[PDB]
Design a protein around this motif. Sequence first.
Motif, PDB file in Angstrom:
ATOM      1  N   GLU A  52       0.805  -1.171   0.238  1.00 26.82           N
ATOM      2  CA  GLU A  52       0.334  -0.511   0.076  1.00 26.82           C
ATOM      3  C   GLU A  52       1.074   1.529  -0.019  1.00 26.82           C
ATOM      4  O   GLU A  52       0.375   2.249  -0.214  1.00 26.82           O
ATOM      5  N   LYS A  53       2.088   1.653   0.364  1.00 27.71           N
ATOM      6  CA  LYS A  53       3.268   2.297   0.276  1.00 27.71           C
ATOM      7  C   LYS A  53       3.913   2.104  -0.362  1.00 27.71           C
ATOM      8  O   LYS A  53       5.133   1.120  -0.791  1.00 27.71           O
ATOM      9  N   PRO A  54       4.444   3.532  -0.952  1.00 24.92           N
ATOM     10  CA  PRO A  54       6.295   3.789  -1.758  1.00 24.92           C
ATOM     11  C   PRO A  54       7.205   2.718  -1.007  1.00 24.92           C
ATOM     12  O   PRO A  54       7.205   2.742   0.056  1.00 24.92           O
ATOM     13  N   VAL A  55       8.420   1.954  -1.579  1.00 19.98           N
ATOM     14  CA  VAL A  55       9.339   2.839  -1.128  1.00 19.98           C
ATOM     15  C   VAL A  55      10.320   3.749  -0.939  1.00 19.98           C
ATOM     16  O   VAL A  55      10.412   3.928  -1.944  1.00 19.98           O
ATOM     17  N   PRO A  56      10.484   3.633  -0.131  1.00 17.86           N
ATOM     18  CA  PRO A  56      10.791   5.066   0.665  1.00 17.86           C
ATOM     19  C   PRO A  56      12.507   4.567   0.395  1.00 17.86           C
ATOM     20  O   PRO A  56      12.971   3.806  -0.843  1.00 17.86           O
ATOM     21  N   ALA A  57      13.572   5.953  -0.060  1.00 15.26           N
ATOM     22  CA  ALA A  57      15.188   6.160  -0.896  1.00 15.26           C
ATOM     23  C   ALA A  57      15.669   4.922   0.411  1.00 15.26           C
ATOM     24  O   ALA A  57      16.446   4.686  -0.514  1.00 15.26           O
ATOM     25  N   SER A  58      15.171   4.325   0.993  1.00 15.48           N
ATOM     26  CA  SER A  58      15.752   3.563   2.340  1.00 15.48           C
ATOM     27  C   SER A  58      15.917   2.070   1.879  1.00 15.48           C
ATOM     28  O   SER A  58      17.161   1.246   1.761  1.00 15.48           O
ATOM     29  N   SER A 107      -7.513  -8.975 -13.996  1.00 20.61           N
ATOM     30  CA  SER A 107      -8.858  -8.413 -13.901  1.00 20.61           C
ATOM     31  C   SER A 107      -9.158  -7.657 -12.790  1.00 20.61           C
ATOM     32  O   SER A 107     -10.062  -6.775 -12.652  1.00 20.61           O
ATOM     33  N   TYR A 108      -8.055  -7.144 -11.884  1.00 23.47           N
ATOM     34  CA  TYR A 108      -8.646  -6.705 -10.770  1.00 23.47           C
ATOM     35  C   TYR A 108      -7.890  -5.821 -10.083  1.00 23.47           C
ATOM     36  O   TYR A 108      -8.445  -4.214 -10.081  1.00 23.47           O
ATOM     37  N   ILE A 109      -6.551  -5.231 -10.864  1.00 22.83           N
ATOM     38  CA  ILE A 109      -5.114  -4.086 -10.527  1.00 22.83           C
ATOM     39  C   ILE A 109      -6.331  -2.897 -11.641  1.00 22.83           C
ATOM     40  O   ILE A 109      -7.166  -3.541 -12.829  1.00 22.83           O
ATOM     41  N   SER A 110      -5.234  -2.140 -11.786  1.00 21.02           N
ATOM     42  CA  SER A 110      -6.286  -0.721 -12.427  1.00 21.02           C
ATOM     43  C   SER A 110      -5.333   0.035 -12.347  1.00 21.02           C
ATOM     44  O   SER A 110      -4.089   0.450 -11.982  1.00 21.02           O
ATOM     45  N   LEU A 111      -4.991   0.250 -13.845  1.00 17.24           N
ATOM     46  CA  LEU A 111      -4.173   1.582 -14.970  1.00 17.24           C
ATOM     47  C   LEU A 111      -4.345   3.112 -14.565  1.00 17.24           C
ATOM     48  O   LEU A 111      -4.224   3.731 -15.047  1.00 17.24           O
ATOM     49  N   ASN A 112      -5.793   2.476 -14.093  1.00 20.46           N
ATOM     50  CA  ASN A 112      -6.976   3.696 -14.718  1.00 20.46           C
ATOM     51  C   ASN A 112      -6.480   4.759 -13.256  1.00 20.46           C
ATOM     52  O   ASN A 112      -7.189   4.188 -11.993  1.00 20.46           O
ATOM     53  N   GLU A 113      -5.717   5.621 -13.545  1.00 21.68           N
ATOM     54  CA  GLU A 113      -5.509   7.013 -12.173  1.00 21.68           C
ATOM     55  C   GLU A 113      -6.843   7.291 -11.217  1.00 21.68           C
ATOM     56  O   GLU A 113      -6.811   7.546 -10.233  1.00 21.68           O
ATOM     57  N   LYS A 114      -7.667   7.319 -12.760  1.00 22.23           N
ATOM     58  CA  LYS A 114      -9.382   7.519 -11.742  1.00 22.23           C
ATOM     59  C   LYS A 114      -9.727   6.231 -11.000  1.00 22.23           C
ATOM     60  O   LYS A 114     -11.231   6.435 -10.034  1.00 22.23           O
ATOM     61  N   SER A 117      -8.776   0.845  -7.891  1.00 22.73           N
ATOM     62  CA  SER A 117      -8.215   0.061  -7.323  1.00 22.73           C
ATOM     63  C   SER A 117      -6.529   0.143  -8.656  1.00 22.73           C
ATOM     64  O   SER A 117      -5.762  -0.504  -8.488  1.00 22.73           O
ATOM     65  N   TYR A 118      -6.682   1.234  -8.836  1.00 25.42           N
ATOM     66  CA  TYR A 118      -5.289   2.002  -9.694  1.00 25.42           C
ATOM     67  C   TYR A 118      -3.778   2.085  -8.499  1.00 25.42           C
ATOM     68  O   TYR A 118      -3.436   1.905  -7.098  1.00 25.42           O
ATOM     69  N   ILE A 119      -2.729   1.294  -9.158  1.00 31.17           N
ATOM     70  CA  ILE A 119      -1.695   0.417  -8.552  1.00 31.17           C
ATOM     71  C   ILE A 119      -1.057   2.145  -8.564  1.00 31.17           C
ATOM     72  O   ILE A 119       0.665   1.382  -8.322  1.00 31.17           O
ATOM     73  N   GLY A 120      -1.093   2.398  -9.264  1.00 28.60           N
ATOM     74  CA  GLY A 120       0.694   3.334  -9.555  1.00 28.60           C
ATOM     75  C   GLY A 120       0.878   4.122  -8.002  1.00 28.60           C
ATOM     76  O   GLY A 120      -0.238   4.747  -7.630  1.00 28.60           O
ATOM     77  N   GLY A 121       2.027   4.405  -8.235  1.00 28.97           N
ATOM     78  CA  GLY A 121       2.676   4.796  -7.432  1.00 28.97           C
ATOM     79  C   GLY A 121       2.849   4.289  -5.480  1.00 28.97           C
ATOM     80  O   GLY A 121       3.014   4.540  -4.381  1.00 28.97           O
ATOM     81  N   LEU A 122       2.264   3.228  -5.942  1.00 24.07           N
ATOM     82  CA  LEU A 122       2.085   1.589  -4.478  1.00 24.07           C
ATOM     83  C   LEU A 122       3.685   1.313  -5.426  1.00 24.07           C
ATOM     84  O   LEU A 122       4.711   1.257  -5.697  1.00 24.07           O
ATOM     85  N   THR A 132       9.231 -13.446   5.164  1.00 20.42           N
ATOM     86  CA  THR A 132      10.164 -12.410   5.352  1.00 20.42           C
ATOM     87  C   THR A 132       9.989 -11.598   3.515  1.00 20.42           C
ATOM     88  O   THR A 132      10.344 -12.458   3.072  1.00 20.42           O
ATOM     89  N   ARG A 133      10.702  -9.930   4.444  1.00 22.80           N
ATOM     90  CA  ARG A 133      10.916  -9.456   2.600  1.00 22.80           C
ATOM     91  C   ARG A 133      11.846  -9.450   2.033  1.00 22.80           C
ATOM     92  O   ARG A 133      12.772  -9.141   2.448  1.00 22.80           O
ATOM     93  N   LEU A 134      11.740 -10.530   0.740  1.00 23.42           N
ATOM     94  CA  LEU A 134      13.705  -9.939   0.242  1.00 23.42           C
ATOM     95  C   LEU A 134      14.106  -9.114  -0.732  1.00 23.42           C
ATOM     96  O   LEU A 134      14.669  -8.284  -0.670  1.00 23.42           O
ATOM     97  N   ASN A 135      12.743  -7.874  -2.032  1.00 19.85           N
ATOM     98  CA  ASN A 135      13.467  -7.388  -2.748  1.00 19.85           C
ATOM     99  C   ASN A 135      11.805  -6.543  -2.931  1.00 19.85           C
ATOM    100  O   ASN A 135      10.721  -6.892  -2.364  1.00 19.85           O
ATOM    101  N   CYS A 136      12.134  -4.813  -3.002  1.00 21.38           N
ATOM    102  CA  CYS A 136      10.742  -4.456  -3.448  1.00 21.38           C
ATOM    103  C   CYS A 136      11.095  -3.397  -4.542  1.00 21.38           C
ATOM    104  O   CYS A 136      12.484  -2.828  -4.215  1.00 21.38           O
ATOM    105  N   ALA A 137       9.420  -2.429  -4.825  1.00 26.68           N
ATOM    106  CA  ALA A 137       9.967  -1.633  -6.496  1.00 26.68           C
ATOM    107  C   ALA A 137       9.071  -1.149  -6.531  1.00 26.68           C
ATOM    108  O   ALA A 137       7.800  -1.781  -5.834  1.00 26.68           O
ATOM    109  N   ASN A 138       9.248   0.285  -6.408  1.00 27.79           N
ATOM    110  CA  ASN A 138       8.470   0.936  -6.352  1.00 27.79           C
ATOM    111  C   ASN A 138       7.649   0.214  -8.141  1.00 27.79           C
ATOM    112  O   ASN A 138       8.198   0.544  -9.005  1.00 27.79           O
ATOM    113  N   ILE A 139       6.623   0.912  -7.947  1.00 30.04           N
ATOM    114  CA  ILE A 139       4.928   1.216  -9.771  1.00 30.04           C
ATOM    115  C   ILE A 139       5.349   2.878 -10.305  1.00 30.04           C
ATOM    116  O   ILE A 139       4.283   3.072  -9.842  1.00 30.04           O
TER     117      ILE A 139
END
Length: 153
Positions: A52-58, A107-114, A117-122, A132-139
């Motif tokens: 639900e939140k972005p990967v920070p600079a760390s 069929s569930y995620i969305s590319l529409n900003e409006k 279910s938009y996943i941009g910026g997550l 255990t969390r291994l690696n992560c990336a911003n969308i």
Amino acid sequence: SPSLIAKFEKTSKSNIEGTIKFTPANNGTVSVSVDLKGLPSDIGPFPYHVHEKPVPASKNCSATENHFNPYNGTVRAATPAAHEVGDLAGKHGNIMGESYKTEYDDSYISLNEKSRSYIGGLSIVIHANNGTRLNCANITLLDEGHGNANTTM
């Protein structure tokens, strides 16, 4: 609605690298293309989710908080639609192996900003089998150029 991409980088924390790409598809679904290598197979298979939140600079994967689950869904389910929106692995299969390449429609995620279910910026987090969390990336946005009078290079 524009295409998105999550780019995984190798660091001292993880050897996982590659991309997960999201492009709008035919059936009002989103086409997902996963291309990963450097996985630590013996602690897999590897659940992965939109968080639900972005990967920070760390690059702290814990800072992405929980699964993107705006429509309250279940972990394991009989039908793909009952899974959490961000629960890519639950719907489509865990990442497996040292290298993993796959393509599917979600069929569930969305590319529409409006869209809700938009996943941009997550973010996307890859987990070991034990969670255990291994690696992560911003969308983020894939194409550089947008607009109806523009081209992209």
